[PDB]
Design a protein around this ligand. Sequence first.
Ligand code: TRP
Ligand code: TRP
Ligand code: TRP
Ligand code: TRP
Ligand code: TRP
Ligand code: TRP
Ligand code: TRP
Ligand code: TRP
Ligand code: TRP
Ligand code: TRP
Ligand code: TRP
Lengths: 69, 68, 69, 68, 68, 69, 68, 68, 67, 69, 68
Amino acid sequence: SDFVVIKALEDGVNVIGLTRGADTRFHHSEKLDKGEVLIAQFTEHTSAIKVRGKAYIQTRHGVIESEGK
Amino acid sequence: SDFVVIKALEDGVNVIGLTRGADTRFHHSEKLDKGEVLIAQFTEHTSAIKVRGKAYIQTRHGVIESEG
Amino acid sequence: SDFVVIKALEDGVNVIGLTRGADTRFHHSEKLDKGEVLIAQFTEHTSAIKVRGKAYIQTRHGVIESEGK
Amino acid sequence: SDFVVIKALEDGVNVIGLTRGADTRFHHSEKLDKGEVLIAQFTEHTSAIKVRGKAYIQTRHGVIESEG
Amino acid sequence: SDFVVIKALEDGVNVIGLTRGADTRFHHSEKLDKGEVLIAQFTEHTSAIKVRGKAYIQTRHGVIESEG
Amino acid sequence: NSDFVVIKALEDGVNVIGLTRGADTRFHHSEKLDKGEVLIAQFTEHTSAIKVRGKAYIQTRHGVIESEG
Amino acid sequence: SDFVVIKALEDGVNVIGLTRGADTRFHHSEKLDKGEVLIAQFTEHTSAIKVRGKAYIQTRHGVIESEG
Amino acid sequence: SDFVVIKALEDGVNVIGLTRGADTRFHHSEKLDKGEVLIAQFTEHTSAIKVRGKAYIQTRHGVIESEG
Amino acid sequence: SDFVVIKALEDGVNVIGLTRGADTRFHHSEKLDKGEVLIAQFTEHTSAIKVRGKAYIQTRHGVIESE
Amino acid sequence: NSDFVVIKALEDGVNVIGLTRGADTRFHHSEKLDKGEVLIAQFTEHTSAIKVRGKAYIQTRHGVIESEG
Amino acid sequence: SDFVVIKALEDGVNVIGLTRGADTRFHHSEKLDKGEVLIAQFTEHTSAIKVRGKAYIQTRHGVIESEG
Ligand SMILES: N[C@@H](Cc1c[nH]c2ccccc12)C(=O)O
Ligand SMILES: N[C@@H](Cc1c[nH]c2ccccc12)C(=O)O
Ligand SMILES: N[C@@H](Cc1c[nH]c2ccccc12)C(=O)O
Ligand SMILES: N[C@@H](Cc1c[nH]c2ccccc12)C(=O)O
Ligand SMILES: N[C@@H](Cc1c[nH]c2ccccc12)C(=O)O
Ligand SMILES: N[C@@H](Cc1c[nH]c2ccccc12)C(=O)O
Ligand SMILES: N[C@@H](Cc1c[nH]c2ccccc12)C(=O)O
Ligand SMILES: N[C@@H](Cc1c[nH]c2ccccc12)C(=O)O
Ligand SMILES: N[C@@H](Cc1c[nH]c2ccccc12)C(=O)O
Ligand SMILES: N[C@@H](Cc1c[nH]c2ccccc12)C(=O)O
Ligand SMILES: N[C@@H](Cc1c[nH]c2ccccc12)C(=O)O
């Protein structure tokens, strides 16, 4: 199973997990402050991940950046 | 299992999941504001994903860009 | 399972899924307008995909471009 | 499971499925007009595919071109 | 399974499937006219394929050409 | 056979925080690393996301990244 | 399952299947004339193949040539 | 299943296996003297490995060095 | 399952199969004359292959030559 | 189907030591190689770590490393 | 399963199979004379292989030579 790496480039970045299945909703929001790194899988409970806030992101398709608010 | 990355290049980008199965219609729409990123899999319930609005998209087959 | 990326290059492009099985017919036609991208898998119900209209297409075998009537 | 990409280079190109099984006969012929693209898998029902008419073809082994 | 691409370079090219199993015989002969392309798998019924006539062939192992 | 991440502490007191797999998300363990130590940590039945706090050099299958304290 | 491609470079080339199992013997010999191609899998019944006569051979390990 | 190579660059390098499971603690410490190499897998009992001391380390993600 | 290609460079080459299992002995020796090629898998009955005589060999690990 | 390590002894008395798989970790076998002998050894149901003592040239899937006596 | 290629560069080379399991002992030694090649797998019965005498060895991790 795949994972994404998220490094917060400012305070208060959210890494948000969306529910797997017929229902889609946020089930968790992980707050990152500046310089922290989260490495998060897709899972039986999370089939999509949203990042909000300025962050440097790595996936198997390469580098992407989210831009803040 | 495959996934796509969608980065919104303007407010109100719409990432649209189409139902897997004999029937096709959309079952969820996730809107992204400018600069937000969605990383979304193909799943038991989603077998096609449509993007409306200006977005920078990555998949296993490279970069593509939707325009609004 | 494989997927194809289709970006409409004009209004009214149709991505048509053909039924899997002994029977071959169109079960769904997804209409795309200029600029929209559809990323569609092959599935239990769709074993061939036809694209009518001007579009830019990526698959595992590379880029190809459909041209409209 | 693999697939083949067929772009028609003139009107009336035929993409023909041959039946999987002890028996080999046609089963379906999909007509493509000029510029249309069909992306077709090998399947439980189809184990060989013939292209007749002028088309640009991509498979995992590269590009090939049929001639009418 | 693996598949082979065969493009007929002259009329009346034969792509022949040999039966899988203890016994080996021809079960099917597919005639290609000049310019036609056959994309053909190995299958439950076919474990060897013979090409007779001038054709351009692609397999996972690269290009080879049969001659009349 | 899961993926793993390599974390090298670049200062004392780095925290490698495992987050619970499953419907609920919480920290189940924080492994504290001192400067120069290396932890090689898999994703597992119990850990589906890993958070790093403090200064560290990190390797994953998508490349190098650095967390900052 | 792997396969070998054999192009006959002269008449009467023999592609010989050896039986899988405790016993080893030839169960089939396919004769190729000049310019014919045979693409042949390893199978439940065939676990070694022998080529006799002048031919051009491709496998996963590259090209090799048998001589008469 | 993955493995880590550890080469001790001084005496008393400690390779520490952490328990797989809901609980985390060390269940084994294997000390290495200078110049000894340990090639250790992840296992049913070890899902994280800590190295203390000066060591040269290879994993599938490249080389890394611990400092003691 | 993997295979070996053997091309005989002289008459009389032997490609010998060794039994899988607790015991090890030769169960078959295939003779190759000059220029003949054998392509031979590992199998349920053969877990090691010995080549005697001069031949050009290819495996997944590249070319080697017996003498 | 498991991974394996190649060990070439560069002096006499090199020991390739197998550590037990499971909850118990101990040495269960020590293979003595003299100069120039090679051992190609798999990870196994019984051996989940391998220790080399003495001067040896080692190849893994991660590359070459050398042990020093 | 992986395999190793051993080419003996002098007479009397020994390729030694070590038992799989909790017990480790030699179960077989195959003697190779100069210029003989043995291609040997890992198996249910053989989880380590030792070579004694001068030989050129190939494995998935490259070339290594043993010296007598
Ligand atoms: N308990 C969550 C943890 C998690 C994994 N990846 C995530 C991405 C975003 C938010 C939460 C997560 C899960 O197993 O699914
Ligand atoms: N609940 C949806 C979440 C999802 C995944 N990928 C998507 C793409 C578009 C819209 C929703 C989604 C699912 O598991 O299928
Ligand atoms: N319900 C359809 C959705 C779909 C996937 N790929 C397609 C290609 C074309 C048309 C529709 C589709 C299916 O699961 O098959
Ligand atoms: N119903 C057909 C659809 C199809 C797929 N590939 C084809 C190639 C040619 C013609 C038809 C097809 C099948 O599943 O087999
Ligand atoms: N009905 C045949 C179709 C076929 C596939 N590959 C072929 C090659 C040659 C001749 C026939 C075929 C089969 O399933 O085996
Ligand atoms: N007992 C934990 C060990 C672990 C693995 N990776 C981790 C990452 C962070 C914290 C603990 C861990 C587990 O099996 O999941
Ligand atoms: N009936 C034979 C056909 C065959 C496949 N590969 C071959 C190689 C040589 C001779 C015959 C064959 C089989 O399934 O095994
Ligand atoms: N009947 C033998 C044929 C064989 C395959 N590879 C070999 C190598 C050497 C000798 C015989 C063979 C088997 O299936 O094992
Ligand atoms: N008996 C332990 C041995 C082990 C493997 N890798 C390790 C890393 C560190 C310490 C011990 C180990 C196990 O099977 O898990
Ligand atoms: N009968 C032995 C044959 C063997 C395979 N590989 C070897 C390596 C060395 C010595 C003997 C062997 C086995 O199946 O295990
Ligand atoms: N009987 C041991 C043999 C072995 C394989 N690899 C080893 C490495 C070191 C020592 C012994 C071994 C086992 O099957 O596990």
